[PDB]
Amino acid sequence: FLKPRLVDIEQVSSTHAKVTLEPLERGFGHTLGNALRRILLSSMPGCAVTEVEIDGVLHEYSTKEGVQEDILEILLNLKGLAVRVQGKDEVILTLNKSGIGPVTAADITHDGDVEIVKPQHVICHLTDENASISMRIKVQRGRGYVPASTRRPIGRLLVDACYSPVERIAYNVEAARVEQRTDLDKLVIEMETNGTIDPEEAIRRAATILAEQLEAFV
Amino acid sequence: PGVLKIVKVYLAVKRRIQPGDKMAGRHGNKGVISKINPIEDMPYDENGTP
């Protein structure tokens, strides 16, 4: 028998990459591929915002003088923030911009662990020289899709959590060029991440989840 | 005549998609949503987009 090993992990772009498992035997290629696609797509640790606390606004369906968007638009934009933390789960950020100009993820005061991978993400647009916006974004780890309905002060606004560092996984079993033994194939897996997870770590973690779940009937 | 003051309070909910909500098209094809299938179980084309 032959046991696959990671050989080449290329990164065409910062979001999507291509992992390769070279020495896969006949049959096990597709079997490994489908399982490693489902596990990768469904269960993978990731960080996303959970609670946002603006300075002046009270509820979600309320405008704010100085911001070109409703608070609902700001919350929706905040939901799609690619934040990678290194340490504790609950970490609270702070944004403070005053002046006409599109606020971005760079304006968020970075701490020693949190590092925003996309500094150009636009949150809101200030349209006056005498306007100011301040928020307290709480970012916590998670797994899967946790709505805001299942999960107290009037100021606090709840935003649905979408912890998923993987967006699009597509594999393709190609016939390997291993000359000594024929019928061998390689498994090329392409993963479109959001910029928080590393392809090698994600692949390894999915494989280990499969391994732990395999210990039941063994 | 006879009332002193009235108070009106407005409540706002955010309904989402639930199994049973009718969702039809423009041409005339109608039908309720049956099951919210997870993304991984939905059919995916060659490029991977489900």
Swiss-Prot record, chain B:
Functional description taken from the UniProt entry: DNA-dependent RNA polymerase catalyzes the transcription of DNA into RNA using the four ribonucleoside triphosphates as substrates.
Family to which this protein belongs: Belongs to the RNA polymerase beta chain family.
Subunit annotation: The RNAP catalytic core consists of 2 alpha, 1 beta, 1 beta' and 1 omega subunit. When a sigma factor is associated with the core the holoenzyme is formed, which can initiate transcription.
UniProt protein name: DNA-directed RNA polymerase subunit beta
Organism: Escherichia coli O139:H28 (strain E24377A / ETEC)
Coverage span on the entire protein: 1044 to 1093 of 1342
